[PDB]
Design a protein around this ligand. Structure first.
Ligand SMILES: Clc1ccc(Oc2ccc(Nc3ncnc4[nH]ccc34)cc2)cc1
Length: 293
């Protein structure tokens, strides 16, 4: 049983059209906003379920408003049966969008531009004191509107966590953190059940961009968490670099050297992308791979 049936109308305003996944430890729905007459995204989680993440998820989404790469907050509410958030609906996610490409790879031209845009999302969420912790292609979507189809968007903040404190300083890490995110893109640290940091989000971005450029990561097959963990740790990452632009050596090297407590040099990563496009003569307003005829 889904949490909501089709044609359930939340708070007399949002009519459930269908499930689309896909959170979040909670289900996500395409819905019609009967007031504004637009389709919207509606994410609910059951109110009798141990981990109730959605309270802060609203708070992150709230603090982020005005930043690019975030969905516009539409509404939220709580009732004895479930909690819900309504926000702007978006186009196809990058995971689906990648598999649509003939050899499972995008070009570098797409990879780099998406890289730059996903990176901004990471920096933005960090900049308000939150780790994402679930950075993966299926958590990024292109726009569905004329004005937005070029823009890439961060979708779900279900696994987010505040890494700052009262004085906004970097809270002490925990004894063990349970790791409950997507196995394939998780950093070595997340595997070892350690407390995640800003750096760990960039690790995912790293692995993502390799899959985008190459079509596969080494450990793509293995479903078993711990095996992936072993394979990642013993693996010589400098080999993943082998098909990327050569300037990626700086990206790998910078994140390899970060830990929980040290702030990333986002600019440094940004420059890797921007130089890599400059040298490959790649413009900002070029067509993405999926608009290719
Ligand atoms: Cl491997 C895989 C896993 C799951 C999967 O379905 C997904 C279904 C839905 C989403 N999320 C969204 N999609 C579009 N607009 C959105 N607005 C806010 C959230 C959101 C994300 C993914 C597709 C592929």
């Amino acid at each position: 049983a889904d949490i909501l049936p089709a044609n359930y109308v939340v708070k007399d305003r949002w009519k459930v059209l269908k499930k689309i996944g896909g959170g979040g430890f909670g289900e996500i729905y395409e819905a019609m906003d009967l007031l504004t007459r637009e389709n919207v995204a509606l994410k609910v989680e059951s109110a009798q379920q141990p981990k109730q993440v959605l309270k802060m998820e609203v708070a992150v989404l709230k603090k982020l408003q005005g930043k690019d790469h975030v969905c516009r907050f539409i509404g939220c509410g709580r009732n004895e049966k479930f909690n819900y958030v309504v926000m702007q609906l978006q186009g196809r996610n990058l995971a689906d969008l990648r598999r649509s490409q003939p050899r499972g790879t995008f070009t570098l031209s797409t990879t780099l531009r998406l890289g730059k845009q996903i990176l901004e999302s990471i920096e933005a969420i960090h900049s308000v004191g939150f780790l994402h912790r679930d950075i993966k292609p299926s958590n990024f979507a292109m726009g569905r509107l004329p004005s937005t189809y070029r823009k890439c968007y961060m979708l779900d903040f279900g696994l987010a966590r505040q890494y700052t404190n009262t004085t906004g300083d970097v809270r002490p890490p925990r004894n063990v953190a349970g790791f409950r995110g997507t196995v394939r893109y998780a950093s070595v640290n997340a595997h070892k059940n350690r407390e995640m940091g800003r750096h760990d989000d960039l690790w995912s971005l790293f692995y993502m961009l390799v899959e985008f450029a190459v079509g596969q990561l080494p450990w793509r097959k293995i479903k078993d968490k711990e095996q992936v963990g072993m394979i990642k740790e013993k693996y010589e990452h400098r080999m993943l670099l082998k098909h990327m632009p050569s300037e990626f050596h700086l990206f790998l090297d910078h994140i390899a050297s970060l830990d929980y407590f040290t702030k990333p040099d986002y600019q440094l990563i940004m420059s890797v992308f921007e130089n890599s496009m400059k040298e490959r003569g790649i413009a900002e307003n070029e067509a993405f791979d999926w608009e290719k005829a």
